[PDB]
Amino acid sequence: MKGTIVGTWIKTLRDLYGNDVVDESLKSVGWEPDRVITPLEDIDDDEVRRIFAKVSEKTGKNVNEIWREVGRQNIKTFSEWFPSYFAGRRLVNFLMMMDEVHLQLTKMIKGATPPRLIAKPVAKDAIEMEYVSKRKMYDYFLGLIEGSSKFFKEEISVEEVERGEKDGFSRLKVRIKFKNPVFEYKKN
Numbered sequence: 001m002k003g004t005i006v007g008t009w010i011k012t013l014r015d016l017y018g019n020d021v022v023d024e025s026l027k028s029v030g031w032e033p034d035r036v037i038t039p040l041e042d043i044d045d046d047e048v049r050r051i052f053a054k055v056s057e058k059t060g061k062n063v064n065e066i067w068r069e070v071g072r073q074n075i076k077t078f079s080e081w082f083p084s085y086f087a088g089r090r091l092v093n094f095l096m097m098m099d100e101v102h103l104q105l106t107k108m109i110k111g112a113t114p115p116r117l118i119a120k121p122v123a124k125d126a127i128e129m130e131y132v133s134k135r136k137m138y139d140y141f142l143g144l145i146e147g148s149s150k151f152f153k154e155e156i157s158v159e160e161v162e163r164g165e166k167d168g169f170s171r172l173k174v175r176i177k178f179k180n181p182v183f184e185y186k187k188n
């Protein structure tokens with residue numbers, strides 16, 4: 001997992017559960033105190049899993065609930081650390097550019113496996129976004145979407161269209177419907 005992104009999760013976990021829980025969890029995996037992660041750094045997915053397992057143990061909360069809460073709260077963290085991706089954008093534009101952003105931020109990582117997040121308009125007021133990744137981080141995915149709605153102050157309804165798993169890849173397709181129209185038909 002891209003290091004700086006794990007960095008956002010650490011900050012978000014501190015916001016949710018406190019420095020004691022987080023410090024203890026990072027200590028359990030040998031994380032240097034006040035460790036600063038650099039842009040080219042990659043952090044083992046298993047290390048991330050172990051950090052979250054410790055937070056779960058200490059807070060008594062199920063790991064899936066933690067990922068859901070982290071997703072909901074991490075958008076704020078992203079808006080502070082990566083402000084350029086939010087400036088002058090509407091929620092629909094933000095969501096539609098995510099697939100490209102994830103490809104961009106993982107390009108120079110050995111064995112890059114970013115999640116695919118292809119979104120496609122399906123109506124004047126809705127898009128279908130399909131999460132595809134071997135990591136099966138459904139709760140985090142859904143949480144970020146909810147947090148994005150809150151950050152952009154644009155109400156949406158989210159319905160699952162379908163989910164599945166094949167050859168190690170998990171997929172979750174959701175239909176995101178906006179209160180007001182966001183698209184209009186134009187000649188192709």
Ligand code: HEM
Pocket residue numbers: 001002005078082085086095098101102105106112113114115117133134135136137140141144145148
């Ligand atoms: C400006 C905001 C965002 C940035 C900069 C960003 C960046 C990233 C990056 C680089 C990773 C690491 C991937 C890897 O190392 O393979 C990641 C993970 C992830 N991102 Fe984002 N992300 C943002 C917003 C979102 C949003 C809005 C969604 C979903 C609607 C999303 C869904 C995910 C998921 C589910 C993962 C977890 C890894 C996986 O499932 O395979 N991200 N993000």
